[PDB]
């Protein structure tokens, strides 16, 4: 397993851009300049490797699971992803629609609801009160 | 440092491996499960796996519970239709007393009337949490449809039987199936001499074989369950191949050509034939994939779909047609090589952790005389041709189908019209 | 408080403020947690760490008629640990914590993840041997001291969702954070 | 012979269903006291899956395994 | 004194007969039932037959109930899969006000939210008392197995739907199926002029036809229900013939040759071929008989058995073989004549009482332009030959089977091995 | 009293002595019955006649926690009829009895039997 961990999260966002990291996470694996569109996905899947990401109140991470034989490619891809994502307008709008749809219906577990409420009341008036996803507005 | 298989005069198999890990793991594996029940004692094995802390001739229930807690350890029980496994985890130096507990749980249980009768109402609860995920009850129905007798029997207790499993049934099942020639003991984090000291306590247990059971007979069934849910789940299979067969490797490669599951978070699965086929038949959320099971005397291969209720007929058909094109021999070297890559890599990843590694070794120990290292598995994978994959697809297309569906079935098709 | 009497069951979470990643005290607290964790379906204790602060508390689900008793039981266990802990239970908690630490780091993925998180939070990888040495120093006196230092007579943060009519009033909850007989 | 009763003979009372409304003057046969079924366990509500990204990976690829532990939640593959 | 059929400009049929009886009976018959439901509104008709005393635009619920009680009368509702009937009984001179009640119940119901929501929990109770007799749920499953869509729909509400039938569904169903061209009004104990005065109130009701539905499609199904009961119930059928057909008369005579039911209290049924066949395959208590249903666009014929659990396979086979011998043309004039005797006599006995006589007339009025007197029925019976009976038996033997079984099925056979 | 706490529900029957076939009073009694016949699942009133004697009473089924109330209700209705009856209900009972008598005699079998 090989990954990049990044010292950034929701507690560094202001109310003007609360929710940016989650947005970026949605279109991280959607294409780079060197690998437009689904070429990156096809090359990951042709190695037999797995690719995952996550985002937290305080951290961010992207990693890959692979065979030890593939380390030169792995790192290559891993560097291509964090420096050269292609933020295309079409893909941005598609992700916007997807996230809005994902927020519309009550797609949250009650546990997550109460823990978000706890952070909001405990750390009110401070950046840690705010959620990773942010408001729909 | 390597594994060492061995068999005692009782017929018990023992194996171990001294990896220098801080946490030792010991598994006792048994040829038992729901396939050895019959219509008169269904659900026995479910209660049996839940009863794994009732009192024994050697230690009180209170003693077992508190003593396992006091060192931080765990005692799990895991079953399938064909095997059961009791596993113990502990820090280095804790083995001996936990091994006494293992011995008493498996070789000398008491099934006191009142403790059993207080344990009954938990079957309902356990089955309920299991049946929250919809996939489980669909697969349960698939086995009932697919087979007439043995692999048909359910993993979870029938509702009409809850509260009416008796102590005598438990005693009879244990006496007739927990026998030394059906057993293996596996140890990770443990030196062979120490595991010999452990196995020594098992020398005077029940000997020989037990009741062998019946062979599974195929059914061309169909089961439909009507609910109000807007999403419908479906499974469509045929009979494929026996566990540990070259033809089973063929079927595995076929599964990975069609599509076995996702690889990228939030991805489009462009490599997956089934997903890309379906994506052109529906515009609302779906899921599709391919399905493999294998047993001692049978196996199943097919497709599994989730879709909206009004779209089901279009989805199920679009999936099925894809397989047919492979049967007609639209298949490419590139796809096949990519599939074998997925398969070799997924296999090696499945055994990074000691927990699954122990399971795999224990599964092999019950059915083979020697341990097969992963290199050999990878070669066997490497040895499948294109013709084998196409033949497997033709077998699926030609043979008699079984089907299950659950949801609002106003537009789901019937097995006869696919 | 978000009230909705149509949901089957009530969900509840209650914390105080924890010390953060850097402090030593975390170890002792974890032991305490392991000691605590019937009335209701589901229950857990938790510690959530940040750079300079954190949340230390518990979460549970209840039938609507059994929220009060459960809160009573939980706060009583807290007061017990602050005032009356003993060696025998502490030993068990230390063993549970040992088992957890070694169980988590199985396979490459968790290990990689631990490396990354550790180099961001601590500046350095902390080896299991150092954790064992830190665990060995805890004793009932340490537990008493540190639990008192973070739990006893403090104002909590509370969140509730569900049929929560029977969730006690905030003054009643605050008064449960101390004993009159001590 | 075009009613169910004239045609079917002794299967007519299972091929037909009836409800006698407000109570009548004579007293009927097969009164049928009612020991109804007990209620199942109550559970939390289900979440929907109204996106492909949320359904991705839900389809089954392999048969199931049933698990339990003395200090761990019961689980299914 | 004779019946008089008649049809109004609305298309409503009316008929009456002034038998000089002290008790008058009036029936309103409608082409409605469960076959006109679909998977999105199952159970509607069950609640509809239970809702027959909720408030209306013309009279309060309290008024309807107490007013019917105060004269001693009754208002019944009876359904099938194809028809519904509302019937009123009263002493001479009571008609008028009860007819107002009938009109408001069928043409102008209110389905107030709170009354419907208070009425829901009675579905569970009604279904429970129905499902105490085991025959009912077996026959329900038989229809589900036998048909893909329409005659498959259940008479009693599905469990997942109880508490979730809405007022809007009731309104929609009534508006789309309670239409004047689907209706007949029948009166015994009533002079045609008086029944004309009654029918006059129906002149401004909903006109024309409604939604016509879908044709039933056959399924070669199989449904198995496992319980612990020591007795197992089974049904095995094929598709036979449409209602009101010569071939249906052939099938009826065949039923009575095989055996339709007992005639002597505590008798041995020596005349019954099925019973005598089975009696030589088992020595513990059994029951067997032959089964007939007929519909507007389909029909079913088969056998029905009750036996011990370990004997089922022997019983079901012994019964089936008997039919086969008739298909091969072991059939005798004497048996055939005796069967026709049983059939003519049973038919004439079925209509001694005014209640069943009204039902029969109302059934005819919905499907034919003129009333058929019993003499004509007896002649039609007289006109069946031996060759027709043998052909019917051959149809059964050759055609695709459907099967249901309920009990402890450890020895019941599967439909494929009969 | 036969006690068996494993059976789901309690069955109960209570009578007094009736007058027999020959007496006229039977008619009036039947009317009374029709007037009487919620708490429990099932309930009935009955008259059973013999040559010189009979049983006049009621039968019911209850949940075990609701036997007392039901007995109270039944005996209260009896006392009510003995002390406080009125014309309006009596009329209804007479009509119910008329309907029963004429409904029973339908078809040859019941008539032969009568
Ligand atoms: C008159 C006018 C009327 C009209 C007026 C109109 C206006 C009125 C408006 C106002 C209305 C108010 C209504 C009442 C509200 C009550 C609220 C309430 O109950 O809240 C529950 C409140 C909420 O908590 P919770 O959610 O229930 O949780 C329960 C937990 O267990 C919580 O656990 P915890 O540990 O936090 O707390 C438990 C502990 C907390 O308390 C303590 O641990 C101590 C508290 C402070 C010290 C008090 C010590 C008193 C000792 C007795 C007296 C001797 C003193 C010394 C002198 C010795 C002389 C020989 O309390 C107890 O266990 C209860 C008993 C405590 C005293 C122990 C002695 C018991 C026997 C008493 C009789 C003795 C008679 C003989 C005496 C000797 C011979 C003369 O919890 C309580 O349990 C509160 C306890 C209240 C105790 C009050 C004691 C008063 C009686 C004192 C003695 C009287 C006799 C004296 C005789 C003469 C000698 C001096
Ligand atoms: C005689 C003329 C006096 C004139 C002056 C004014 C008189 C009135 C003054 C107020 C008197 C109040 C008496 C009633 C008690 C009120 C208690 C109160 O308000 O505090 C609540 C609080 C409850 O605690 P919670 O935080 O809610 O729960 C904690 C759970 N972990 O009460 C307590 O402190 C309870 C514990 C006991 C406190 C002491 C009770 C009184 C007696 C103490 C002295 C004992 C000796 C008495 C001798 C009397 C003469 C023989």
Author numbering:
A (entry chain l): 70 to 206
B (entry chain k), E (entry chain K): 36 to 453
C (entry chain l): 276 to 312, 336 to 480
D (entry chain T): 1 to 77
F (entry chain L): 276 to 312, 336 to 412
Question: Mind quoting what the paper says about this structure?
Answer:
CIII (cytochrome bc1 complex) plays a crucial role in electron transfer and proton pumping. The pumping of protons into the cristae lumen occurs via the Q-cycle, which involves sequential ubiquinol oxidation and ubiquinone reduction. Both reactions occur in specific quinone binding sites within the cytochrome b (Cyt-b) subunit, called Qo (oxidation) and Qi (reduction), which are essential for catalytic activity. Likewise, in the apicomplexan mETC, complex III2 (CIII) is the primary target for antiparasitic drugs.
